[model samples]
Target: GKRSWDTESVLAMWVLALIVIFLTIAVLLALRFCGIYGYRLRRK
Candidate 1:
């Protein structure tokens, strides 16, 4: 038998949430490390 919509929806939302969170974290770290945002290295 196939799974119900309720179960599928929960899994879908969980995956979506993880993707969104990871993307946000990745962007933030990238920006900070690349000196495009937040703390950055001082050039002499």
Candidate 2:
């Protein structure tokens, strides 16, 4: 017997991957910005 991939399963996997990538990028950017601002504030 041959089996085919389910469309709903593929779509769910793609959506989960995209959400994780977006969250990782957002967190990294926020940390970078906070580090820069904190350094400047300390210098003043």
Candidate 3:
């Protein structure tokens, strides 16, 4: 029988963790770069 903590299985878990982290940072950056929250850019 194969070992419980095999090499391939461990690597898969590491890749999953990295994906979640990077995705979070990208979402935050997009929010900071914009603000319709400013209501029309200037006082017209």
Candidate 4:
């Protein structure tokens, strides 16, 4: 017998959450590096 579709829905939600977390971390790292460079330029 086949189980209900709720299991599949939960799996999809986890996959989406992982993708969002990955992208958020990537963007934050990029912003941090850029800010450091910008500060150095201003100090010169």
Task: Find the candidate with the highest TM-score and give its number.
Answer: 2
lDDT of 4 at 41: 62
Model 2 CA lDDT for position 29: 91
CA deviation > 4 Å runs, candidate 3 = 36-44
Candidate 3 pairs with clashing backbones: none
Better of 1 and 4 by lDDT: 4
What's model 2's lDDT at 24?
A: 99
| lDDT of the structure predicted as candidate 4 | 0.85
Name the weakest run of 10 consecutive residues (lDDT summed) in model 4.
35-44
Give candidate 4's TM-score. Answer: 0.67
lDDT of 1 by residue, 1-44 (tens): 56556787888999999999999999878887887543555654
Tens digit of per-residue lDDT, candidate 3, span 1-44: 66587878889999999999999988777656654466337667
Candidate 4 residue-pair clash tally: 0
Off by over 4 Å in 2: 1-4, 39-44
- In model 2, what lDDT does residue 10 have? 91
Pairs that clash in candidate 4: none
Against the reference, the lDDT scores of all candidates come to 0.80, 0.85, 0.76, 0.85
What is the per-residue lDDT of model 2 for residues 2-44, given as tens digits with 9 covering 90 to 100? 3777778998999999999999999889878988778446554
Model 1 worst lDDT run, 10 consecutive residues: 35-44
Tell me the TM-score of each prediction against the true structure.
0.64, 0.73, 0.63, 0.67
